[PDB]
């Protein structure tokens, strides 16, 4: 966390800093999408 990483969360490739998120996801929700439809938050699979 707080570092640039080539991330592969549940098969979603990306390059970005990852930080703790205030946003709360409902159990069905696993990913968060912004206006541009680019994932802005991901729930970690190993730790929810």
């Amino acid at each position: 966390k707080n570092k640039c990483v080539n991330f592969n969360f549940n098969g979603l490739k990306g390059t970005g800093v990852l930080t703790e998120s205030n946003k709360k996801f409902l159990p069905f929700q696993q990913f968060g999408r912004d206006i541009a439809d680019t994932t802005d938050a991901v729930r970690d699979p190993q730790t929810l």
Partner: protein, 41 residues
């Protein structure tokens, strides 16, 4: 007053700003050469 115009936008994940999202999609706003103090002078 009548007309309303990285570390800031990194900590702006709790709030939502259209300037931070425009910066993160590569669309930045350059400042003018003359400030408001100089247009006023």
């Amino acid at each position: 007053n009548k007309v309303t115009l990285y570390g800031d936008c990194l900590g702006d994940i709790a709030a939502r700003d259209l300037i931070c999202a425009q910066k993160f999609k590569g669309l930045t706003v350059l400042p003018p050469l003359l400030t408001d103090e100089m247009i006023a002078q």
